[PDB]
From a paper:
Here, to gain a better understanding of fungal xylan degradation systems, which can enhance enzymatic saccharification of plant cell walls in industrial processes, we conducted a comparative study of two glycoside hydrolase family 3 (GH3) β-xylosidases (Bxls), one from the basidiomycete Phanerochaete chrysosporium (PcBxl3), and the other from the ascomycete Trichoderma reesei (TrXyl3A). The xylan main chain is degraded into xylooligosaccharides with low DPs by xylanase, and these products are further degraded into xylose by β-xylosidases (Bxls). PcBxl3 consists of three domains: (β/α)8 domain, (α/β)6-sandwich domain, and fibronectin III (FnIII)-like domain. The relationship between substrate specificity and degree of polymerization of substrates suggested that PcBxl3 preferentially degrades xylobiose (X2), while TrXyl3A degrades longer xylooligosaccharides.
To uncover the structural differences between PcBxl3 and TrXyl3A, the crystal structures of both enzymes were solved. There is a single molecule of PcBxl3 in the asymmetric unit, whereas there is a protein dimer in the case of TrXyl3A. N-Acetylglucosamine moieties were found at Asn17, Asn40, Asn74, Asn279, Asn286, Asn398, Asn432, and Asn437 of free PcBxl3. The overall structure and order of these domains are the same as those of TrXyl3A. The FnIII-like domain is connected to the active domain by a linker, as in other GH3 enzymes. The conformation of Glu470 (PcBxl3) is the same in the native and liganded structures of PcBxl3, but Glu492 (TrXyl3A) has different conformations in native and liganded TrXyl3A.
Numbering used by the authors: 1 to 743
The structure:
């Protein structure tokens, strides 16, 4: 329900005055309320205040890749009825594999539209706990499937697009569409590995790594995209739980990244964890108190509503702290149109007709088609047209709900690889074969019989929610169970053999890489509701592959070279380094790697520049139309991409940078720019524009300070160093962005 501002008990409170300042309306609502009532509404499952006609409002809604199940979400229980389903896009890991920022904005628009409709039905809030922008740093993380990948720059671009699409522009022009929430702020990328439970874990993070790896995405989300909400993390960073750290919430989130009057929710009773099990405060009241003074405005739990009155009476917090939090929450609601009449709000008109739109379904399909990565191919793909009888085998072959990952809703449909092969007209012999993770070989003979007479074999396997999930990290990053044994037995048949490696995290597929009998390999992640159709469109050649790995495929032994608790990224006395930036070993498949159905010849469309003076770049930063010096340009490369093959294809141009100047050691590579060139027909030459910022090229020192250093720099335009360029910066080392030193 919404408050009645025409006739309800608040119709003369300034909150119901539609032309008034939002913060003034929030202050008028808060000032008319009892301290005890305000404390009552410091939690996600807020009762409202019946005395003033303020209805209940639940802050906990989920929409990570489409409207999702949550305490605040209500799917209809009649399967064909209104609000019985919503568009279930692929997991953000495949979305990040697309490297298509525009597509991310479109997907965010669809999600916000459907969420608005559900809220108009009383089946969702106006306020969703998305996105997850913690880098998928360690390959074992059970929640990395929820993220765009392991590169902070890529995550930053992704999250800019997603926040602006979800909230409706860079500002509430009339209103917020929905209020997004970039979540788990501060060093959270671990579930329960080796008994290190997230709710008791202490992330020891250097200042350099905090500023260089763990927070740039929050820069983009909070400072550049103007998110209206941040969620503070379960864990501790350097001894202080996130939600009770005023250095993190005030100095970094609100001040450095400019959240301002935007509100901060805890993770779901992380305030409770500040007491138990973090043992940071010796009482629950003091846990609530220090979390509130640090900057946690609303508690995803009942701890605040049970303790904050005690905390005011014990002088641990003031009534004004509670009032400030409440003003933040209600100001956000005011900017959402909560206290405005629905007559002039188009977003208050969206209904069930606006959910599973033909265009939204096509968009989910397009996302899956651009995200799937072709890891290996010898020409077998796209499938020969004489291929007719196909055996589909594996614990993912007929995957329906598996394709949705976690944090999902109810989809209108789930098109499995099996069904999409049947939709395409193939004569299919299906066999489970074996489970995701078991020692039972009973199904092997059945799969062999399915494959014995076939024209081609499609094995679909990997990991899923039973292997990686919130609260469960992986111990091994190998294929689970005996899946590889069955793939080997199928390869013995020496037929055309295609292997679909699914799941969010990567598994060691090097054995498949080295086998001549495995003719093709694709990573399908969690591909969403139309995943099978996308995969089969790729297999048949109806759509050409173009997706690229958003994370590294590590060799299995990586799990023995570094513990998951090691928050450092640089190589060390005990670490081979983390991510493509620092890993000293040999990935099975590199970050950004991907194959196409055609060849590309790359050259310079404009002659690239050779030298820059640092003071000149800093001076010109003031005169480019950007809000902060780190957002101003270094340059824009123009690359010509000739389709030298015979098949129309997209191409993701990825610009990597390396340097030896400034702080040592330097990363091996950093992704500084990328762009998706669409629909290059055979013979044509398309031009890709690659814009690098001063912030992407500036180095972070031991203090978290980001500066421009004068030295020699190089750039290249694929993982295969497809063209290459050297330039040089000259002048004084000059600071581009400061860093608040830890309290
Ligand atoms: C809202 O307040 C302004 C002054 O702040 C006043 O001019 C206007 O009439 C008020 N509108 C309503 C609907 O009360
Ligand atoms: C706080 O909420 C509880 C549960 O709805 C209710 O019993 C109590 O009266 C509320 N307190 C005030 C001051 O409204
Ligand atoms: C929506 O939720 C309410 C309770 O929150 C429940 O009574 C109702 O049945 C739900 N809607 C449907 C269609 O089941
Ligand atoms: C909590 O920490 C205090 C010191 O900060 C210590 O004395 C106490 O034993 C700890 N209690 C628990 C339950 O961990
Ligand atoms: C509450 O916790 C903080 C930080 O642990 C501590 O400094 C403070 O003394 C505690 N308050 C009380 C009343 O014990
Ligand atoms: C494929 O999965 C669906 C569940 O979504 C099931 O109804 C169907 O029977 C399965 N097909 C086969 C051949 O197992
Ligand atoms: C395939 O797998 C599921 C296990 O989740 C099983 O219940 C199903 O009946 C199997 N299908 C066949 C045709 O044996
Ligand atoms: C597979 O199951 C076994 C037994 O439950 C377990 O020890 C192993 O960790 C599982 N594999 C994965 C990758 O989770």
């Amino acid at each position: 329900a919404f408050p009645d501002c025409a006739n309800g008990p608040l119709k003369s409170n300034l909150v119901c005055n539609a032309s008034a300042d939002p913060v003034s309306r929030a202050k008028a609502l808060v000032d008319a309320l009892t301290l005890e009532e305000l404390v009552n509404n410091t939690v996600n499952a807020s009762p409202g205040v019946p005395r003033v006609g303020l209805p209940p409002y639940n802050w906990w809604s989920e929409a990570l890749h489409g409207v999702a199940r949550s305490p605040g979400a209500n799917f209809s229980t009649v399967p064909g009825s209104p609000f019985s389903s919503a568009t279930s896009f692929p997991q953000p890991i495949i979305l990040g594999a697309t490297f298509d920022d525009d597509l991310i904005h479109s997907i965010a628009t669809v999600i916000s539209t459907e969420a608005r409709a559900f809220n108009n039905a009383g089946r969702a809030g106006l306020d969703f706990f998305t996105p997850n922008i913690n880098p998928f740093k360690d390959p074992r993380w059970g929640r990395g499937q929820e993220t765009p990948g392991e590169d902070p720059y890529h995550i930053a671009q992704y999250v800019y697009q997603l926040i602006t699409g979800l909230q409706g522009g860079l500002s509430p022009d009339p209103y917020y569409k929905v209020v997004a929430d970039c979540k788990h702020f501060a060093g959270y990328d671990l579930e329960d590995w080796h008994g290190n439970n997230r709710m008791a874990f202490n992330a020891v993070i250097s200042t350099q790594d905090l500023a260089e790896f763990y927070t740039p995405s929050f820069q983009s989300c909070v400072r550049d995209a103007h998110v209206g909400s941040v969620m503070c993390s379960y864990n501790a960073v350097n001894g202080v739980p996130s939600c009770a750290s005023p250095y993190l919430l005030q100095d970094l989130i609100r001040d450095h990244f400019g959240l301002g009057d935007g509100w901060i929710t805890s993770d779901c009773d992380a305030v409770d964890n500040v007491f138990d099990p973090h043992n940071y405060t010796s009482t629950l009241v003091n846990a609530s108190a220090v979390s509130l003074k640090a900057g946690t405005d609303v508690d995803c739990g009942t701890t605040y509503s049970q303790t904050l009155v005690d905390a005011v009476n014990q002088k641990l917090v003031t009534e004004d702290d509670v009032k400030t939090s409440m003003v933040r929450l209600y100001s956000s609601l005011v900017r959402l149109g909560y206290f405005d009449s629905p007559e002039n709000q188009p977003w208050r008109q969206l209904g069930w007709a606006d959910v599973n739109t033909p265009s939204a379904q096509a968009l989910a399909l397009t996302a899956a088609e651009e995200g799937v990565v072709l890891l290996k191919n010898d020409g077998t793909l796209p499938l020969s047209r004489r291929i007719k009888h196909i055996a589909v085998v594996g614990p993912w072959a007929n995957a329906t709900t598996q394709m949705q990952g976690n944090y999902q809703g109810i989809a209108p449909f789930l098109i499995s690889p099996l069904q999409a092969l049947q939709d395409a007209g193939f004569h299919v012999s299906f066999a489970n074969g074996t489970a995701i993770n078991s020692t039972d070989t009973s199904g092997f003979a059945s799969a062999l019989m399915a494959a014995k007479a076939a024209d081609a074999i499609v094995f679909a396997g990997g990991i899923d929610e039973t292997i990686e999930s919130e609260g469960h990290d992986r111990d091994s990053i190998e294929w689970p169970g005996n899946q590889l044994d069955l793939i080997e037995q199928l390869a013995a048949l020496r037929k055309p053999l295609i292997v679909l490696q699914m799941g969010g995290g990567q598994v060691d597929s090097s054995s498949l890489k080295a086998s001549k009998a495995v003719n093709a390999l694709l990573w399908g992640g969690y591909p969403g509701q139309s995943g099978g159709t996308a995969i089969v469109n790729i297999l048949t050649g109806k759509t050409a592959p173009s997706g690229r790995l958003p994370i590294t495929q590590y060799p299995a032994a990586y799990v023995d070279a570094i513990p998951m608790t090691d928050m450092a990224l640089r190589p060390s006395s005990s670490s081979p380094g983390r991510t493509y930036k620092w890993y000293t070993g040999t990935p099975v498949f590199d970050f950004g790697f991907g194959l196409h159905y055609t060849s590309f010849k790359l050259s310079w469309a404009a002659s690239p520049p050779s030298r820059f003076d640092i003071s000149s770049l800093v001076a010109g930063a003031k005169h480019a139309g950007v809000a902060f010096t780190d957002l101003a340009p270094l340059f824009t490369f123009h690359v010509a991409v000739k389709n030298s093959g015979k098949v129309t294809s997209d191409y993701v141009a990825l610009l990597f940078a390396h340097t030896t100047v400034g702080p040592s050691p330097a990363p091996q590579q950093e992704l500084v720019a990328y762009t998706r060139v669409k629909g290059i027909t055979p013979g044509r030459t398309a031009t890709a524009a690659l814009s690098v910022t001063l912030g992407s090229i500036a180095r972070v020192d031991e203090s978290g300070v980001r500066s421009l250093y004068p030295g020699k720099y190089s750039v290249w335009v694929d993982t295969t160093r497809e063209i290459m360029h050297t330039f040089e910066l000259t002048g004084k080392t000059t600071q581009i962005l400061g860093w608040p030193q830890p309290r």
